């Protein structure tokens, strides 16, 4: 293992580093990871009502950098342009998605298309930090210690607890959101069950089971199937979750989004790929080998031929020269 | 339910009296004479009257013991605070009276230590009385003085210049070595102390200075003056909040007028009340730079200061390391950090913890030149951690009266039968001392002096230069 | 303090005077009243003119009478923010057994609990006096000798006078004029460390003492740093230019640092703040104005309007109803109204007409002709004329 | 001034063989950028540079003081109690003995 994996994937859900789901529709900044002891660094997340933002990294006391779904990168409230490397955080861009890396300090976050904030985090903090996406320990019952510490049963008043101010911005308690879905149920829950179903159902997701349960993934699902109206693609975000939650762990699973119907958003040229190297053959590189021993990542890239070149994918004979 | 233990028995809040202090109040060691409130008692299991509760544990004597550093002492256990032992009796920790030799200091270029216990911020580049004894209404035997050059702001400027003025002499310091413009009356007090990286230096019964070679001036008193002196060190009263008493005589409240008071030319320049803040002139608007300085001042609070942490509180010489190495611009010589550690390892010295903080990647501080004059390489000089200062020399082979328990520096250690000169760098048995003994007594090795002035009649001279058995006549009054 | 001054001239400290001669100021001794002070989060000053922090959740003893026992009080701390570094003070509690061994609580609003019932204000007990001072602060007068303040959002504060020279004992000290030894724990040593001083005063042994003291709380809330500078940098602004050379503003400008990158709403902890620098500007001579609409200038009702320096003796009704009573009060700063206007209960002021009488404490309205068989009482305009 | 040592009586020697204007360059360009508190080594390492071009040319040079980056030496003769004191810093020692 050697690493933790968080994730606040599709609208207001959050996945802890250790199997404990919960939903949270902030109204601000709040700390995902980071020391409790002494803080090196600290991972921010901002909502700006329920629906998410940006990603925050404040390494300290000097240095800041606020990335967005947007992605119009800034270092303080200078927006700089991208890539960008100061002060050991390399913000880069991987298979068509963004990254953060802070190799040095135990990190690395990223932003998807659709926007799902990821936070890979060494073992060097293991049973030390405690924020947003809880302490990284085995258990996964205990992940609720408040900022005082304090186990608390509601996954509600723990995230307000973890809340970050500033002087363009205090903020107060977020109110959990009022369900519509409880008068306008219907038909939507007889023929929308199957989506959810279909973690447990279907061969290409039958076999991560003595890996992980989807058992919560399930429950997470059946209560955002409900708001959404005329879709089967109100499932996918929750069983997109599934399909990389069981690829950390040691076991990876392929072309379940074939017959899925739902292929996560990315720019033109390129499409969901699963299992591609970081090291993506670019034009403008240089032929060289077994330097990029990195582990597989997912996300989406160019065809077979058709190297990148600027956020595009081009074909090979079209390679340009650059002075 | 559960019968509480036979030690302690059940307690009941009677319905009529109000004052029902029970469980509420629990009596442990800590708050027995302090006094509690109550509104009303608990069904809790309490001790009896004559008893306490203890950790878990209804200890039945008041002989329960006496915290320091929330740590135990049994009752007759003692404790060394200073210079005075301290035992505890009533529960109550019971010491002695006797006053302590304390210490001004400049640590680093603009701050100044006082006797009381006072750090203050005072940038000043005139000359300036550090301490001295002509005070109101009293004779004025000594008056030490200090003076800056180009040290307003802290760099690898700011030499320091002193001059001390004790028995009609004037001997004074810089640029390394030690200067006698006019040599003082009684010889016989005076002693010069060249030993490790510092210059001890007495001048009398109760008096002494220390000095780092480089900026550190640590005048140290004896109980003999209380409230005889006054300068930037102040009265030395053991009040503590009176030592910015001008020489106008009124306490101010910034020192930065306080110290333009004690200026000797009355003409130069009074130095400019700063702005202030939390970052210096380099560190300001430069908080990147801000956190490399203070993380690196840190070493104050580390794993080989932790025994001294719970001693002297390093606050004061934290403040003064982030001060002075913004304002330093530290290029080739990184002295102005190195020297601020330094004067606080040197004060947990003093309260018997010596450390060894000091590694290759930090401060380097070699000794091999010293054994270098000598084709054959004999290997003595050493840098010791903190080794005493007052040893025996040819040049002092008496013990001398010692301010200062160890030091830092490079000391030379070789096997014994042998006693160090410094002329002649390295250790020599001791015949090859040029020592003194003139019909029989036991004394110093020639010092130059001349004795017996009291009594014509028996004026029997015998001086020794380096190793004669001679003896002068006196030339009569007649 | 860099300025020059004639020969013969008396400058006067708050303490005592001194006066010119031959270039030497000569200057009395004699003692001056200590204040201990709590404010902030955590943030104490001793007698002795003592400034430090104790972030411990327990009953502690902040003062004591200990030759003899004429009182002592105590405070009591709880957390305060979702932060570990926050904690401010909820309550007081005092003891006088000089009265019934009575039990006096100052709750966390301007509230006032003797004996576990609440009381409405004033309470001309005896000796003790509690009474509102801007009609949102209480102050507690026992005797000549003892001064108390609100303990409603924790800015409490006494003033104990010469009489208690070197005879007290508690977190705030001996009062004895030297700052040095007030870390002396109850078996009588002086304790380095603070973390080992205020845990030794606890009342309660179930009370967890902390092992360490923090000094920067933004480390914990990164994004409060950048705030926390441009907000107090005003400390040291040419706006209180005046009262440099009166108090020492390094520790009030280290207190706000602490204050604001640890509370809840850094709005308020600001400018609860930088008042606590202007009210000891204050307490020696200097009035700052301080106050703007982006500086926390505060809302006085319709009826009421801002002021800076004024009486409040010819402030409400009931001064007309006991005139000859003395108002040995200063010039002090609040909401007040004007001159033909005077203060009525329900928080409107009114002209002189229509303000009621208080004769025997029964609120009387402003024309209630009144009469037992002997006496005969009518209320005019706030003053109730009795005859016989 | 601190970058003339460079240009200084123990320099010399080689001054006239190797041009020590590039090596100046640099260490004017590093110590301003480096904010040097507790490691002067981004001043002792540029000289360094300099002195070991100097010693390939057979010009061997001692520049190296107590009060200028002082590379000490003596925690290697530690690990023994006696102190037998044979490790030293050495001007320009061969590197390839046996
Ligand atoms: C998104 O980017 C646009 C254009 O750069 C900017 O105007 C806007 O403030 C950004 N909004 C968010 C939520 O980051
Ligand atoms: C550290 O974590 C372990 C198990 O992960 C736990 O048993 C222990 O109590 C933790 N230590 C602290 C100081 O909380
Ligand atoms: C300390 O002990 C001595 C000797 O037993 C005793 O004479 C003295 O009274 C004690 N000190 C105090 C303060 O009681
Ligand atoms: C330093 O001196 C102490 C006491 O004199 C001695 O015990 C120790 O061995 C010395 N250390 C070194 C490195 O010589
Ligand atoms: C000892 O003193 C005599 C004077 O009486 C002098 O001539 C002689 O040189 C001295 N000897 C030494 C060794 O200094
Ligand atoms: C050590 O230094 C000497 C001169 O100091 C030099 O001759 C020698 O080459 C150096 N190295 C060795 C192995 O002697
Ligand atoms: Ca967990
Ligand atoms: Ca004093
Ligand atoms: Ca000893
Ligand atoms: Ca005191
Ligand atoms: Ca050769």
Do not use: E, F, H, R
């Given at each position: 293992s050697s690493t933790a994996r968080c994730s606040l994937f599709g609208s207001d859900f959050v996945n802890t580093f250790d199997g404990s789901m919960y939903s949270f529709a902030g109204y601000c900044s709040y700390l995902l990871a980071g020391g409790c002891q002494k803080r090196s660094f600290s991972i921010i997340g901002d909502f700006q009502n329920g629906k998410r933002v940006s990603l925050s990294v404040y390494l300290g006391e000097f240095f800041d950098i606020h990335l967005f779904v947007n992605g119009t990168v800034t270092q303080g409230d200078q927006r700089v342009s991208m890539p960008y490397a100061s002060k050991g955080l390399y913000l880069e861009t991987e298979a068509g998605y963004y990254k953060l890396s802070g190799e040095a300090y135990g990190f690395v976050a990223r932003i998807d298309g659709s926007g799902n904030f990821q936070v890979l985090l060494s073992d060097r903090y293991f049973n030390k930090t405690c924020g947003l996406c809880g302490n990284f320990n085995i258990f996964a019952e205990d992940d609720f210690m408040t900022q005082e510490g304090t186990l608390t049963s509601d996954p509600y008043d723990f995230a307000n607890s973890w809340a970050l101010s500033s002087g363009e911005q205090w903020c107060e308690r977020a109110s959990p959101p009022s369900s519509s879905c409880n008068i306008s149920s219907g038909e939507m829950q007889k023929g929308l069950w199957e989506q959810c179903q279909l973690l447990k159902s279907t061969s290409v997701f039958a076999r991560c089971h003595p890996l992980v349960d989807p058992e919560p993934f399930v429950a997470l699902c059946e209560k955002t199937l409900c708001e959404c109206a005329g879709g089967l693609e109100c499932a996918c975000p929750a069983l997109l979750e599934y399909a990389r939650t069981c690829a950390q762990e040691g076991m990876v699973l392929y072309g379940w989004t074939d017959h899925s119907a739902c292929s996560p958003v990315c720019p033109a040229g390129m499409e969901y790929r699963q299992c591609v190297s970081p090291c993506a053959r670019t034009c403008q590189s240089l032929h060289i080998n077994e330097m990029c021993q990195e582990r597989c990542v997912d996300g989406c890239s160019c065809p077979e031929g058709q190297l990148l070149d600027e956020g595009l994918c081009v074909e090979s004979t079209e390679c340009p020269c650059v002075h | 339910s559960l019968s509480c233990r036979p030690p302690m028995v059940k307690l009941v809040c009677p319905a009529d009296n109000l004052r029902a202090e029970g469980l509420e109040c629990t009596k442990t060691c800590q708050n027995y004479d302090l006094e509690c409130m109550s509104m009303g008692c608990v069904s809790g299991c309490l001790c009896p009257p004559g008893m306490v509760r203890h950790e878990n544990r209804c200890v039945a004597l008041e002989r329960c013991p006496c915290f320091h550093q929330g740590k135990e002492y049994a009752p007759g256990e003692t404790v060394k605070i200073g210079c005075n032992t301290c035992v505890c009796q009533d529960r109550k920790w019971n010491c002695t009276d006797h006053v302590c030799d304390a210490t001004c200091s400049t640590i680093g270029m603009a701050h100044y230590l006082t006797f009381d216990g006072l750090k203050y911020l005072f940038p000043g580049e005139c000359q300036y009385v550090?301490?001295?004894?002509?005070?109101?209404s009293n004779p004025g035997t000594f008056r030490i003085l200090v003076g800056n050059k180009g040290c307003s702001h802290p760099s690898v400027k700011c030499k320091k210049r002193v001059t001390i003025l004790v028995e009609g002499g004037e001997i004074e310091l810089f640029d390394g070595e030690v200067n006698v413009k006019r040599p003082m009356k009684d010889e016989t007090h005076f002693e010069v102390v060249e030993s490790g990286r510092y210059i001890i230096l007495l001048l009398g019964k109760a008096l002494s200075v220390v000095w780092d070679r480089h900026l550190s001036i640590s005048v140290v008193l004896k109980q003999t003056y209380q409230e005889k002196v006054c300068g930037l060190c102040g009265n030395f009263d053991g009040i503590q909040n009176n030592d910015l008493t001008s020489s106008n005589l009124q306490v101010e409240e910034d020192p930065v007028d306080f110290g333009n008071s004690w200026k000797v030319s009355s003409q130069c320049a009074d130095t400019r009340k700063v702005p202030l803040d939390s970052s210096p002139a380099t560190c300001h608007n430069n908080i990147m730079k801000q956190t490399m300085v203070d993380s690196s001042c840190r070493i104050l609070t580390s794993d080989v200061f932790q025994d001294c942490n719970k001693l002297v509180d390093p606050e004061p010489y934290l403040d003064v390391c982030i001060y002075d190495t913004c304002s330093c611009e530290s290029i080739g010589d990184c002295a102005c950090f190195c020297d601020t550690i330094a004067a606080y390892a040197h004060v947990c010295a003093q309260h018997g913890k010596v450390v060894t903080w000091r590694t290759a990647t930090l401060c380097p501080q070699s000794c091999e030149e010293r054994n270098l004059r000598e084709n054959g390489y004999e290997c003595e000089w050493r840098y010791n951690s903190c080794a005493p200062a007052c040893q025996v020399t040819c040049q002092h082979p008496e013990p001398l009266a010692c301010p200062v328990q160890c030091v830092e520096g490079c000391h030379a250690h070789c096997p014994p039968g042998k006693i160090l000169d410094e002329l002649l760098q390295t250790c020599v048995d001791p015949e090859d001392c040029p020592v003194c003994e003139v019909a029989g007594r036991r004394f110093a090795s020639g010092k130059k002096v001349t004795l017996n002035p009291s009594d014509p009649e028996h004026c029997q001279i015998c001086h020794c230069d380096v190793v004669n058995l001679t003896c002068e006549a006196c030339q009569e009054p007649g | 303090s860099g300025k020059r001054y004639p020969p013969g001239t008396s400058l006067s400290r708050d303490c005592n005077t001194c006066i010119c001669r031959n270039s030497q100021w000569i200057c009395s001794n004699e003692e001056c009243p200590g204040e201990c002070l709590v404010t902030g989060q955590s943030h104490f000053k001793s007698f002795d003119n003592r400034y430090f922090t104790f972030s411990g959740i327990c009953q502690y003893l902040l003062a004591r009478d200990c030759q003899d026992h004429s009182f002592s009080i105590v405070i009591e701390t709880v957390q305060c923010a979702d932060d570990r570094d926050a904690v401010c003070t909820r309550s007081v509690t005092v003891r006088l057994p000089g009265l019934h061994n009575s039990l006096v609580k100052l709750k966390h609003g301007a509230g006032v609990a003797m004996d576990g019932q609440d009381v409405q204000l004033p309470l001309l007990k005896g000796d003790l006096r509690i009474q509102h001072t801007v009609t949102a602060s209480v102050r507690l007068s026992y005797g000549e000798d003892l001064q108390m303040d609100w303990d409603g959002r924790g800015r409490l504060l006494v003033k104990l006078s010469p009489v208690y020279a070197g005879k007290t004992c508690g977190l705030c000290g001996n009062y004895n004029g030297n700052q040095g030894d007030d870390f002396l724990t109850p078996s009588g040593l002086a304790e380095p460390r603070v973390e080992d001083f205020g845990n030794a005063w606890k009342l309660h042994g179930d009370c967890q003492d902390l092992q360490k003291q923090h000094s920067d709380p933004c480390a914990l809330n990164p994004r409060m740093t950048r705030f926390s500078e441009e907000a107090c940098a005003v400390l040291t602004s040419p706006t209180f230019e005046a009262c440099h050379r009166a108090v020492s503003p390094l520790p009030y400008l280290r207190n706000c640092r602490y204050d604001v990158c640890s509370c809840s709403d850094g709005r308020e902890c600001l400018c609860g703040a930088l008042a606590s620098y202007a009210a000891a500007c204050a307490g020696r001579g200097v009035r700052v104005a301080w106050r703007e609409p982006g500086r926390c200038e505060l809302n006085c009702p319709k009826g009421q309007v801002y002021l800076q320096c004024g009486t409040p003796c010819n402030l409400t009704c009931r001064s007309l109803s006991y005139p000859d009573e003395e108002c040995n009060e200063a010039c002090l700063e609040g909401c007040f109204c004007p001159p033909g206007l005077y203060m009525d209960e329900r928080g409107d002021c009114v002209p002189k007409?229509?303000?009621?009488c208080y004769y025997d404490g029964e609120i009387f309205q402003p024309e209630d002709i009144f009469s037992d068989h002997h006496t005969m009482c009518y209320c005019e305009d706030g003053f109730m004329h009795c005859t016989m």
């Open positions: - | 550090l301490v001295q004894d002509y005070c109101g | 007409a229509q303000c009621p």
